[PDB]
Amino acid sequence: MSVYPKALRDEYIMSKTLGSEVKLAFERKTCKKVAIKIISKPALNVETEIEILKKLNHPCIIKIKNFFDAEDYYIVLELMEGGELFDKVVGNKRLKEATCKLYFYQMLLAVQYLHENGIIHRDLKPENVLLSSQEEDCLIKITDFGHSKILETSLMRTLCGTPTYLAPEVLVSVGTAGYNRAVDCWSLGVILFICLSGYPPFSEHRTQVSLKDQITSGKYNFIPEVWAEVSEKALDLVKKLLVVDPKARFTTEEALRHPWLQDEDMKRKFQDLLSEENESTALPQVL
Numbered sequence: 655m656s657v658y659p660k661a662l663r664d665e666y667i668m669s670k671t672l673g674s675e676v677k678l679a680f681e682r683k684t685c686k687k688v689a690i691k692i693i694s695k696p697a698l699n700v701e702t703e704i705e706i707l708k709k710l711n712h713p714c715i716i717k718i719k720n721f722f723d724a725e726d727y728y729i730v731l732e733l734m735e736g737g738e739l740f741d742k743v744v745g746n747k748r749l750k751e752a753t754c755k756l757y758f759y760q761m762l763l764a765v766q767y768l769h770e771n772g773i774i775h776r777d778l779k780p781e782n783v784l785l786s787s788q789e790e791d792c793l794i795k796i797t798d799f800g801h802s803k804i805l806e807t808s809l810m811r812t813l814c815g816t817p818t819y820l821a822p823e824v825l826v827s828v829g830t831a832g833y834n835r836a837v838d839c840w841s842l843g844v845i846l847f848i849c850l851s852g853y854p855p856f857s858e859h860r861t862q863v864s865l866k867d868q869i870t871s872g873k874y875n876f877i878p879e880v881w882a883e884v885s886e887k888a889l890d891l892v893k894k895l896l897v898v899d900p901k902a903r904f905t906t907e908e909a910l911r912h913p914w915l916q917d918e919d920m921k922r923k924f925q926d927l928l929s930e931e932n933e934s935t936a937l938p939q940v941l
């Protein structure tokens with residue numbers, strides 16, 4: 655095969671594969687577990703991923719612990735013991751609605767925080783949502799920022815200029831510019847749909863309409879049997895997220911104000927989990 659870089663070996667003992675690639679590792683200094691993402695050599699996506707993770711600071715967004723640029727790229731992250739949200743929804747497995755809500759609330763908070771900070775994720779899927787423990791009441795963090803974008807400066811400059819020569823299509827694009835972040839809200843809607851129902855809104859399974867046609871039409875596969883079990887409030891929010899027009903689509907703020915999320919119990923649980931995660935690092939402070 656091949657060997658791990660010496661600088662990596664110097665600080666970590668590498669262990670089992672967790673997914674593929676992500677490996678379990680032990681930090682020598684602390685004897686604590688970490689996760690190490692190995693990216694085969696690329697530079698562009700890795701450079702941005704790192705610079706983004708370093709600057710972001712939010713409980714529902716994964717933190718970077720270390721970085722090694724060698725034969726391959728190594729990104730050292732927090733270990734999320736609960737693993738990927740994906741494993742909870744595969745094989746038509748479904749989460750109970752109350753659990754969906756606790757996880758979705760935190761997803762919303764994370765994506766809201768991204769957008770406030772001028773970052774779009776662009777590739778949000780159940781496999782990029784991590785769970786902090788094997789308990790179903792737990793914290794989630796978003797990860798995998800390789801496809802992210804940093805927020806129209808070109809257009810704005812173009813607008814400050816000799817309008818005389820400006821091309822029609824440029825002027826037309828002004829109507830929609832600055833709504834790229836809406837793709838994350840679409841992704842959140844699909845993820846929420848899947849968590850609630852245990853099946854994807856759009857797929858080629860038992861249907862003759864192309865996946866593409868389903869998506870651009872916004873006509874998701876609605877199976878009343880499955881959804882009978884789910885509140886009308888939950889379904890209403892999905893509908894507002896799976897809106898085809900990006901300017902009309904619910905923002906994270908709108909989603910957070912939605913009746914389905916006005917749930918002080920769920921919020922208390924999150925706040926409880928937060929404080930628990932933090933006890934081990936909380937210093938004393940001025941009374």
Ligand SMILES: CN(C)CCNC(=O)c1cc(-c2scc3c2OCCO3)cnc1N
Nearest residue numbers: 672676689731732733734735737738781797
């Ligand atoms: C690359 N992308 C698809 C996912 C990245 N995954 C992580 O960053 C990550 C994964 C895990 C996992 S996955 C399965 C597990 C596990 O940890 C506990 C044992 O079972 C943990 N931490 C991560 N940062």
